[PDB]
Amino acid sequence: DDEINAQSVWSEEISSNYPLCIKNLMEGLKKNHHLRFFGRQQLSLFLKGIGLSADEALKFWSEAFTRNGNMTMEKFNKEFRFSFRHNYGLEGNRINFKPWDCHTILSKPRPGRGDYHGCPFRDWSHERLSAELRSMKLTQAQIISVLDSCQKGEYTIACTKVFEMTHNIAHPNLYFERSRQLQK
Numbered sequence: 001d002d003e004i005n006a007q008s009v010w011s012e013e014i015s016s017n018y019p020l021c022i023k024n025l026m027e028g029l030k031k032n033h034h035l036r037f038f039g040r041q042q043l044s045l046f047l048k049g050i051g052l053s054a055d056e057a058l059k060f061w062s063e064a065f066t067r068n069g070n071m072t073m074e075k076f077n078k079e080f081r082f083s084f085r086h087n088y089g090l091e092g093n094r095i096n097f098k099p100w101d102c103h104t105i106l107s108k109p110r111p112g113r114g115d116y117h118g119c120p121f122r123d124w125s126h127e128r129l130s131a132e133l134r135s136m137k138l139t140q141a142q143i144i145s146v147l148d149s150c151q152k153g154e155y156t157i158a159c160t161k162v163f164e165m166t167h168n169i170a171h172p173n174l175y176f177e178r179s180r181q182l183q184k
């Protein structure tokens with residue numbers, strides 16, 4: 001809990017290790033104080049995978065959903081608490097939901113307006129990707145190479161390129177673990 005907790009998953013240190021899908025989900029959560037079902041699952045199971053405990057997850061999700069009076073804690077408890085507890089087996093279900101790999105993520109229904117699940121390398125325009133990658137300090141040649149992979153439908157190669165270019169078989173939690181090791 002010292003390293004990964006409801007607070008540190010918002011830190012720059014820990015979030016600098018997130019792949020683009022998780023960054024997108026965290027941004028949608030921060031902006032909207034809510035995520036629709038598929039994004040809730042993609043992000044909550046990723047965070048479980050990096051070691052966010054059940055207690056810290058319930059702190060994280062209830063704080064994020066109730067921010068700015070978006071909903072009362074009563075509403076969170078009546079409409080969402082069970083769903084997050086279920087993801088951690090706290091209601092006795094005896095199914096240990098695993099984090100989604102990239103194939104599972106890509107195989108879910110493609111995101112529409114208001115959805116943040118999926119894979120940005122597939123789901124964003126080249127203009128939106130280039131803007132994000134510029135913000136991550138990549139150069140034009142680097143971005144062209146990433147977009148080359150996206151154009152070919154090779155989304156996990158695009159993501160691997162972004163990893164290589166921002167640092168010194170396909171799974172968001174592997175991206176996180178590899179990146180986190182390079183801080184350590």
Ligand code: SF4
Pocket residue numbers: 019020021022101102105106118119120121155156159170171172175
């Ligand atoms: S390739 Fe996988 S880890 Fe990378 S952004 Fe897409 S879904 Fe996330």
